[PDB]
């Protein structure tokens with residue numbers, strides 16, 4: 001099926017330790033896509049045994065939702081896995097906050113709404129995102145958000161289920177994870193609380209003036225206080241999403257969790273349905289505005305365990 005031959009490696013658009021993301025062009029179609037590349041050796045050594053399976057499953061659910069990147073195709077070389085993904089060209093919230101420094105409540109309200117719809121959808125599908133942060137919140141040309149990089153997702157969580165992996169991006173990691181407690185969807189809502197805080201305050205609730213051990217101490221012990229300039233509505237949601245007790249945290253009620261959010265005074269006057277069909281207009285249009293592969297290690301590749309990657313190839317019959 002697909003392979004590197006069928007593509008033109010245009011540029012690099014993302015680079016972590018585990019994963020690398022390229023901008024690519026499907027030759028025979030002249031369409032542009034984003035490509036996520038990961039060394040299969042690290043997939044075996046660093047990830048849960050069902051990582052490949054969880055990724056494929058998550059992309060499936062994401063193709064049927066407006067605020068989630070969908071999967072075009074994926075293939076494998078001897079040493080790497082390749083995820084060809086719907087391309088988003090509006091940048092991300094981090095880039096936006098970089099120029100904005102601080103967003104009006106209306107803007108944060110909009111974004112946090114769309115983010116909630118994407119999250120609740122994953123939760124409904126028994127999935128925990130587990131890595132919501134500014135730069136994982138992409139923006140399309142129109143100005144709507146899109147969650148990307150599903151590398152941290154947990155799958156198959158039934159009602160009452162609970163997982164126990166310590167993961168995430170330190171600044172956004174929930175207290176219940178820090179305590180080593182079994183957790184569920186609650187971590188995602190805490191993450192949104194932290195993200196909402198950055199949007200409206202212009203800084204993290206845990207900014208300063210063992211560096212990471214100290215950060216974890218701040219999150220667990222230091223009292224979270226909302227700045228005096230924010231409205232009573234805003235102060236509430238922040239404090240509610242940022243409740244260190246998963247049981248008492250906003251959006252975490254097993255039954256009325258997501259209803260409690262939509263009902264929150266902060267989200268008053270929000271048409272969720274129109275929000276979900278993109279019938280609500282974004283407060284910022286990235287358009288009209290603003291401003292190669294590492295060689296394999298033959299001694300490693302030769303001994304790689306290809307088991308988990310058998311039958312990895314795939315193409316989506318419906319263009320995401």
Ligand SMILES: N[C@H](CNc1nc(-c2ccncc2)nc2sc3c(c12)CCCC3)Cc1ccccc1
Pocket residue numbers: 013014015016019020021034036069085086087088089090091092135136138148149150
């Ligand atoms: N944070 C953006 C660049 N990084 C990434 N962008 C996208 C992406 C997906 C779809 N359309 C666009 C981007 N997906 C991913 S998955 C991943 C990373 C990443 C980096 C860390 C490792 C895992 C910022 C950015 C936005 C737009 C263009 C270039 C960069």
Ligand SMILES: [Cl-]
Pocket residue numbers: 222223224244
């Ligand atoms: Cl507190």
